[PDB]
């Protein structure tokens, strides 16, 4: 997980995290999803571009970004703050 290892292990990414916030993820699995998304964000650098989206019968962004962003310290902090606010309610729809 060190910056140099992650840099030398692959090339820059265009990551898009798609989080399931349907009703059935309510409980322990939602909390684990939040922690896992934060940990995955912890592995990205300034050459990588990331955005986090959620879907429950309708897909939308979790924050005020709406497209891929530079994934520097500030943008990652905004994404983490937005992710630690999602609630589980609705019906799953993978196609949307």
Partner 1 sequence: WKPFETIILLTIFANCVALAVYLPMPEDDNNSLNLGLEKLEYFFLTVF
Ligand X SMILES: CC(=O)N[C@@H]1[C@@H](O)[C@H](O)[C@@H](CO)O[C@H]1O
**Residues of the binding site for a divalent metal cation:** 20, 22, 24
Torsions phi, psi for 63 (to 5 deg): -140, -165
Question: Per rule CB under 5 A, is residue 92 in the interface with Ca ion?
Answer: yes
Distance CA 75, CA 63 (A): 10
Helix (H) or strand (E) holding 3: helix 3-9
State the binding partner of 81 from partner 1, Ca ion, ligand X, none, CB within 5 to 8 A by kind: ligand X
The residue at minimum Cβ distance from ligand X is 85
Smaller CB separation from ligand X, 17 or 82: 82
For the segment 63-82, give every residue that binds ligand X (CB under 6 A).
81-82
Q: Which of 2, 8, 11, 85 binds ligand X (CB under 6 A)?
A: 85
DSSP one-letter string for 15-53: EEEEEE-SGGGTTHHHHHHHHHHHHHHTT--TT-EEEEE
Residues at the site binding partner 1, with contacts judged by CB under 8 A: 22-24, 26-27, 88-92
């Amino acid at each position: 997980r060190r910056p140099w290892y992650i840099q030398g292990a692959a090339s820059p990414k265009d990551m898009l995290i798609l989080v399931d916030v349907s009703g059935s993820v309510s409980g322990l699995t939602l909390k684990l999803i939040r922690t896992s998304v934060s940990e995955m964000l912890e592995t990205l650098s300034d050459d990588d571009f990331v955005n986090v989206a959620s879907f429950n019968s309708n897909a939308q962004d979790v924050s005020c970004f709406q497209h891929l962003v530079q994934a520097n310290v500030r943008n990652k902090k905004v994404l983490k703050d937005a992710v630690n606010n999602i609630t589980a309610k609705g019906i799953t729809d993978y196609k949307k």
